[PDB]
Amino acid sequence: STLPDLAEQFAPPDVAPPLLIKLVEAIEKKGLECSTLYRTQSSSNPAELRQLLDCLDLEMFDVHVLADAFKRYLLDLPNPVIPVAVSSELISLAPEVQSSEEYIQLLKKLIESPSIPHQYWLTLQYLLKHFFKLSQTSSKNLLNARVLSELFSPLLFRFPSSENTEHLIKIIEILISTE
Amino acid sequence: STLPDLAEQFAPPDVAPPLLIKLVEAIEKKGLECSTLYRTQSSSNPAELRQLLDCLDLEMFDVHVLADAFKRYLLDLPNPVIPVAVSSELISLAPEVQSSEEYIQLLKKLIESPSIPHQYWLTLQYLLKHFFKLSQTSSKNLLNARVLSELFSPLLFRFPAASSENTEHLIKIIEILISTEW
Incomplete structure (x- = not known):
């Protein structure tokens, strides 16, 4: 788990970590209307999700994997x-x-x-x-x-x-x- | 007295705060060989030096003012x-x-x-x-x-500390x- 501190991932004037922005924009593109978004078990395991939080367009991934990587990211912040x-x-x-x-x-x-x-x-x-x-x-x-x-x-x-x-x-x- | 925390002034992949890079590069351009660099005081007072740590190109300033603003920067970091x-x-x-x-x-x-x-x-x-x-x-x-x-x-x-x-x-x-x- 090499995820950097929030404070090392961006600084003002950027408004959020760039990885978090990529996740959030891909999830809202693909999952805004999904009635199980964020409530479904992980088809992928933590090691695979962590691989995704290094490296290329996140829209290519299954939306339930994106939602899991989002959770993984919040859990892995130091x-x-x-x-x-x-x-x-x-x-x-x-x-x-x-x-x-x-x-x-x-x-x-x-x-x-x-x-x-x-x-x-x-x-x-x-x-x-x-x-x-x-x-x-x-x-x-x-x-x-x-x-x-x-x-x-x-x-x-x-x-x-x-x-x-x-x-x-x-x-x-x-x-x-x-x- | 303002000056943000180091951790708010830049983030990787930048290697240092952008203001500190401007100070250091100007001082090295103008003062690398100066025999009193950092060992003499300039005329400016802390309020004037802090004023400089906001606005121009820093090569425009006197090198002894730049050297004092460098010290001022290290002191004003929260x-x-x-x-x-x-x-x-x-x-x-x-x-x-x-x-x-x-x-x-x-x-x-x-x-x-x-x-x-x-x-x-x-x-x-x-x-x-x-x-x-x-x-x-x-x-x-x-x-x-x-x-x-x-x-x-x-x-x-x-x-x-004693x-x-x-x-x-x-x-x-x-x-x-x-x-x-090196």
Whole structure:
């Protein structure tokens, strides 16, 4: 697993990692209306998917393989899209905080910290925009913000169930809806 | 006071921050043989030097202003080229770690940590290449690797520490890394 850090894959003024852009654009070209997108088991194994995340046009691949490589990419980032410091803070507040708007404002403040490269928040925004675009054909693909949040929150936060973890999933659900 | 983190200023396959490349190339074009390069102050103050670290072609500036803006850049980085995580570990090493080679081996392992983006080590290497190129016209500019390490180690590490046999060891590895570039 040689996937570089998000901060090593691109820098401002680019808006997202180029590999993630290739994946997302190919998936939206081929899979926007697919009623099992991102919910189907992997026909390929991790080693083969990793091969794909090095090398040529991603439209040539089966869309269910692209969706798996997308998941593989989020799992192989050496640090997750939402860093563990951020997750740890949000989780340790949950008995005491319940306001979703407060968690959301705090997620933005934590992830835009000077100690965290801006690439992390830029990537999260690119992901949220993808997830939101999927949710606009949810009558066909069955992916609304809530389902997208249950699928991807564990890959974004990198967590394997309290009222806490539920609060993280709800944050992502609201963040997808309000784009 | 602005200046983004090294890891936001560029990314692989670029080898260094674009602003730092402009500074180093202009300084080497105009000052390679200058016998007081980096050892004299210019008239400009930090606010004026920071002003320069935004806007023209840097070859237009006085070479002593460029040299001061270089120092200003290393000082205004939100984290130093060699992060405090790395310095804290290197300073904690025992006298039984007598070995310059071991200090260097530990610097490389710690700075290439997954917690530290590759941009930090890449910038350090770009700087070492500059310093090495300076030490090769030492017969004219009077700079050897050891003096370049005494001048720039406090800017690369940015570390308040009493002058110990540890800090002597940090100055020493920078000295060695400058010489062993080519």
